[PDB]
Amino acid sequence: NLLYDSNGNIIGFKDFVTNKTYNIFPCYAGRVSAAFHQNASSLALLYRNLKCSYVLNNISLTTQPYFDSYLGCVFNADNLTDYSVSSCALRMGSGFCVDYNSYRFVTFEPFNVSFVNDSIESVGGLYEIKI
């Protein structure tokens, strides 16, 4: 009548009155990430590995702006992933950051290569070098 795993958990079930096989899964009991800046008043919320629909329909219901990111669902922050910041104090992961000016979800690029306007070919056997 039951189906167990190789550890001692419960995955299966069989109703003896209807002859139907069911499965068992635990519902969400995760955690929330909160980014806060001492100059602001509100918070920047992040539900990791969750679609915004699952949060708005099952977890809770808020009246704040929200969007979907690579890490999860972000609340109280706009989508500005095309702007890079060198120095960040709110690191979220996977090269993302939260800036305050009002929270903005931006990228993290701390190091960049210095570019020079010189050629790469050799004309007459000579190269262009800055001394």
């Binding site: 550890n7 001692g8 958990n9 995955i11 499965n23 899964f25 635990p26 969400y28 009991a29 995760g30 955690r31 990791r48 590995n49 969750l50 679609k51 699952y54 690579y70 890490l71 690191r91 992961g93 996977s94 090269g95 993290f108 690029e109 701390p110 190091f111 290569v113 210095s114 570019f115 020079v116 306007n117 010189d118 050629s119 790469i120 190269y127 262009e128 070098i129 800055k130």
Partner: protein
């Protein structure tokens, strides 16, 4: 030696480690008020565990930032430089070691080598993200990561993705092959290889006459290192070892929630539904003690293990500084044998170094002299090589390639008084 070749050797050095976060209350208790009221007596273990975990996770990010800064210390590239048609210089093919795909030169930094290396292990940061995204939805089998994430144990991604370290390694590799060559003291790659080979005791004539052969040997060694991964190589084993150890540790920590520890049951629901309140508070105490002991043991093990990967990352930084960007007079440091140069690439939780070495294949027996004494009772000693006698005339030869050369002032050391066991040759004037 009378004939030589170039060989390649790979090495993997671990830099980062998966970041594990545990929820004390959700691990010891679960949605139960009596368990929390009884745990409130031990009001110091959870905060200390959280503080130790945060201190552990901070240093990994700091070390990753240090490595990222070290990889791009003095890299200076050119603006008019694209990788879609510029991938070979001086008969050296390096297309399989550069990224920068597309017009924007971004969002795809891993090359063919890094792709082949990453396609072996799936439990990377992107792997953990894709695994955790599959816990809400689907009627497939229940993965262990999802049942671990619902109890408090969760793996968080690092602050810098692998696609950024790949773009740094790509720039570091490109900076050594196009002007300005700010990775080889400002000389081309072929001339740098020639000078490194000549510094071992090889003449310049054989290097100038056999440049294409050296390039072909370098390409063959690179291809061998590339296609030598579909085997039992130790690099892939070292890469899989950390993931396997982390998985085993997480499983052993999760299995601690199904032990009675001297109580009557491993579930608080069975205890709070069959025993009276004033007596049921005895088994919960034993369960809490056992779970706190397990958590303390895991925290101690993690804190003891972190220092190893920290020192490994320090050694990797030193290797990048003293083997890739420059060559230091240190024997058997970068690689075993006559070291020429080394290249660096990214790898799951660390770096992969490819060292190129000079290996002879055929030898010839000769007679040599450590020094000579000439007319003015003046001693002459070889710089790097030996003195031979060919066609009844003293000449000089190298220590790594048999090529006789006439004795000149550019390969000898003078001494105002020669030793007592020097060959007497009072017919050589300089």
């Amino acid at each position: 030696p009378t004939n030589f070749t170039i060989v390649g050797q790979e090495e993997f050095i671990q830099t980062n480690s998966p970041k594990v976060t545990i929820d004390c209350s959700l691990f010891v208790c679960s949605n139960y008020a009596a368990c929390h009221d009884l745990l409130s007596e031990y009001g110091t273990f959870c905060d200390n565990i959280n503080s130790i975990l945060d201190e552990v996770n901070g240093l990994l990010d700091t070390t990753q930032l240090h490595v990222a800064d070290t990889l791009m210390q003095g890299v200076t590239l050119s603006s008019n430089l694209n990788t879609n048609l510029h991938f070979d210089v001086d008969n050296i093919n390096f297309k399989s070691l550069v990224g920068c795909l597309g017009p924007h030169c971004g969002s795809s930094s891993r090359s063919f080598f890094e792709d082949l290396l990453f396609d072996k292990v799936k439990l990377s940061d992107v792997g953990f993200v894709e695994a955790y995204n599959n816990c809400t939805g689907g009627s497939e089998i229940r993965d262990l990561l999802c049942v671990q994430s619902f109890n408090g144990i969760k793996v968080l991604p690092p602050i810098l993705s692998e696609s950024q370290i790949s773009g740094y390694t790509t720039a570091a590799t490109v900076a050594a092959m196009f002007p300005p060559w700010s990775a080889a003291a400002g000389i081309p790659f072929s001339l740098n290889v020639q000078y490194r080979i000549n510094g071992l005791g090889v003449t310049m004539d054989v290097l100038n006459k056999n440049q294409k052969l050296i390039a072909t040997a370098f390409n063959n060694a690179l291809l061998s290192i590339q296609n030598g991964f579909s085997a039992t190589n130790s690099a892939l084993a070292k890469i899989q070892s950390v993931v396997n150890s982390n998985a085993q540790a997480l499983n052993s920590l999760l299995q601690q929630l199904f032990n009675k520890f001297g109580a009557i049951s491993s579930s608080l629901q069975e205890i709070l539904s069959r025993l009276d309140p004033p007596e049921a508070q005895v088994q919960i105490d034993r369960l809490i003690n056992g779970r706190l002991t397990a958590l303390n043991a895991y925290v101690s093990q993690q804190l003891s293990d972190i220092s190893l990967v920290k020192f490994g990352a320090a050694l990797a930084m030193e290797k990048v500084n003293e083997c890739v960007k420059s060559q230091s007079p240190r024997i058997n440091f970068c690689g075993n044998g006559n070291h020429i140069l080394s290249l660096v690439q990214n790898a799951p939780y660390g770096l992969l170094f490819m060292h190129f070495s000079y290996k002879p294949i055929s030898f010839k027996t000769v007679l040599v002299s450590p020094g000579l004494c000439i007319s003015g009772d003046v001693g002459i000693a070889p710089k790097q090589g030996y003195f031979i006698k060919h066609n009844d005339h003293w000449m000089f030869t190298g220590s790594s390639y048999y090529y006789p050369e006439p004795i000149s002032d550019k390969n000898v050391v003078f001494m105002n008084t020669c030793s007592v066991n020097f060959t007497k040759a009072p017919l050589v004037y300089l």
